[PDB]
Amino acid sequence: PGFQKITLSSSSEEYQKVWNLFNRTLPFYFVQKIERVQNLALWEVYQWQKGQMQKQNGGKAVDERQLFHGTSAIVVDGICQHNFDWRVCGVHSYGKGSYFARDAAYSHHFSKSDTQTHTMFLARVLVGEFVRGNASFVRPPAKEGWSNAFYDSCVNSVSDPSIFVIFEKHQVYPEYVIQYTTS
Template sequence: VKVKQACSVKFQGPKSIPDHWDPSALPDPGFKKITLSSSSDEYQKVWNLFNRTLPFYFVQKIERVQNLALWEVYQWQKGQMQKRNGGKVVDERQLFHGTSANFVDAICQQNFDWRVCGLHGTSYGKGSSFARD
C-alpha cells in the first residue's frame, strides 16, 4: 500500500508586526522608512517625547523604520528577557540616538553597532549611547 501525504504551506505574512506598521512596506531583506504625518498619533507621541528636553529645536520630519528582520530579533530578545524575569512584562522605553546622516541607513539596515559608530561613538566607553527623551 502506498500512502501519499499532501502538505501545503500558505503564506500568512509576517509573524507579528506592530499594528501601526504598513504591511505593504516590508521589504525582505532590508528596511523601509515611512514618513509620518504630523497629524498622526504616532508622530505626536514621538514629537512630545523629543520636545520635552529639546523644546527649541524644529522637527523637520519623523520617520518610522520598518525592518522585519530587526523587529523579529527584538521580539526574540524581549522574550528572552521576560523568561529571565519570571515571565513578567519587560519595561520598554523610547530612546533617541543622535548620529550623522551618513550612518542612518547603516543603522536602519544592521542595527546599532558600537564598532562602527563614527567620530564620537566611544566618548562614554565602548557601546552605543542613547537618551531617554
C-alpha cells in the same frame, strides 16, 4: 532592501507621540520630518531577545524604553538596515556599548551636520534590570546574591537614569528617524 522608512503625517497620533518626546527637551528647535523604520529582520531578533528576557524575568514584562540617539545623516540608512553597533566607532565611558539618552537635548550634542538639518533616532530599548556602569565594562556585571544572573544594561543612576549603555544589538530596534533644524 531590508527596510522602509514611512514618513508620518504631522496630524497623526503616531507623529504627535514622537514629537511630544522630542519637544519635551528641544522646544526651541523645529522638527521637519519623522519616519517610522520598518525592518522585519531587526524586529524579529528584538522580539526574540525580549522573549528571552521575559522568561528570565519570571515570565513578567521587561523594562522597555524609547531612548534617543543623535547620529550623522550619512549612517541613518546603515542603522535602519544593520542596527546600532558600538564596535563601528569604539568609546574613548559607562561601558563599551551603544549609548541611548532619555533626553533628546542630550543626544543633540552627537547629531553632527555642517548644515541646518540634524538627525536623531528614537530607538526602542530593552533596558531590563540596570546598574551603574564603569569605563572597563565590556558587558553588564553580575547581580550580587545571584550565582547565575547578570544585569541587562548599564546606566548613570538607578534611582534616576538618563543614559543607558546596551551591549547586545538585539536589545535595540531603531524605530523612528527625526529630522529637525535649530532655527
